[PDB]
């Protein structure tokens, strides 16, 4: 019974209680707001391709 | 030392920027008024985009952009129609010649403002010796096309126009205003016929007098 005297708790439940979730990446932030960001600068700017000026104030031609 | 493009060009760029005030928007109509601009439309649009978007507003920015909305030919019915709040807000604020501006390019243009029209002739006939001949012109004019079928300020015009010696253009106004209101009243109307009597200096007038002594039919003069 020398296996009576060793940790009952695995290496696996350390492991898996350590480790319990994936953590966030600090990039993560980033390439989110700058992927959502980049809408903002395409509707909201006055030099992007697609503004939304002329489609909400639209012209007095 | 003349070049009229370029100052339009930055008038261009005065009206193009983000928080233009009302009084960039009404100075920079007042100056293409006054230099006929009438070939580029794109700019007077711009400059009415910006008197629509423009929210503080005095008595003489107002007057000087709706004399320049008249004097220029414009019409964008939305934005001088807009225009009743800064009227309506502003009327006891208003100087006489003031009312008389705001009434008659509000008027000229077709705004439905009963408000406006009721407190102008509550104005008009509670300040009634106040005014030049001019500015009962003006008021007839703008109550008249305005849709309103006022009696009261016809009539209190009427006795000015028996009582004072008026301009063949005021007289010219007078006639439109009360043709429009189709009254044919023979006390005023050849009271405002002695007007006629220095040559008139548009031929606008003389044509706008025209058409309302043949509307109303009363002589070839």
Do not use: C
């Given at each position: ?61 | ?162 009582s004072t010696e008026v301009d063949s253009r005021t007289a010219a106004q007078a006639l439109y205003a009360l043709a429009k209101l189709g009254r044919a009243d ?19 007038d003389a044509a706008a007098a025209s058409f309302a002594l043949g509307s109303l039919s009363f002589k070839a003069e």
């Amino acid at each position: 019974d020398r296996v009576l005297s060793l940790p009952a708790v695995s290496k696996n439940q350390v492991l898996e209680n350590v480790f319990h979730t994936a953590p966030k990446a600090p990039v993560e932030h980033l390439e989110k707001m700058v992927s959502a960001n980049s809408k903002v600068y395409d509707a909201l700017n006055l030099q992007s391709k697609r503004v939304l000026i002329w489609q909400v104030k639209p012209a007095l031609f | 030392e003349n070049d009229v493009p370029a100052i339009l060009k930055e008038i261009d760029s005065l009206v193009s920027r983000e928080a233009v005030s009302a009084k960039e928007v009404s100075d920079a109509a007042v100056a293409l008024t006054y230099l006929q601009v009438k070939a580029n439309r794109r700019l007077w649009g711009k400059v009415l985009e910006k008197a629509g978007a423009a929210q503080d507003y005095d008595a003489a920015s107002l007057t000087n952009l709706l004399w320049a909305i008249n004097t220029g030919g414009v019409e964008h019915f939305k934005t001088v129609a807009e225009l009743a709040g800064p009227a309506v807000s502003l009327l006891p604020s208003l100087s006489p010649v003031q009312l008389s501006i705001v009434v008659e390019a509000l008027g000229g243009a077709g705004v439905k403002n009963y408000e406006l029209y009721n407190k102008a002739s509550a104005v008009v006939v509670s300040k009634i010796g106040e005014f030049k001949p001019a500015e009962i012109a003006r008021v007839l004019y703008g109550v008249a096309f305005g849709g309103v079928n006022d009696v009261a300020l016809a009539k209190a015009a009427g006795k000015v126009f028996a009582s004072t010696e008026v301009d063949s253009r005021t007289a010219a106004q007078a006639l439109y205003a009360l043709a429009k209101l189709g009254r044919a009243d023979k006390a005023t109307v050849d009271a405002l016929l002695k007007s006629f009597k220095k040559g008139t200096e548009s031929a606008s007038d003389a044509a706008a007098a025209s058409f309302a002594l043949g509307s109303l039919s009363f002589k070839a003069e």
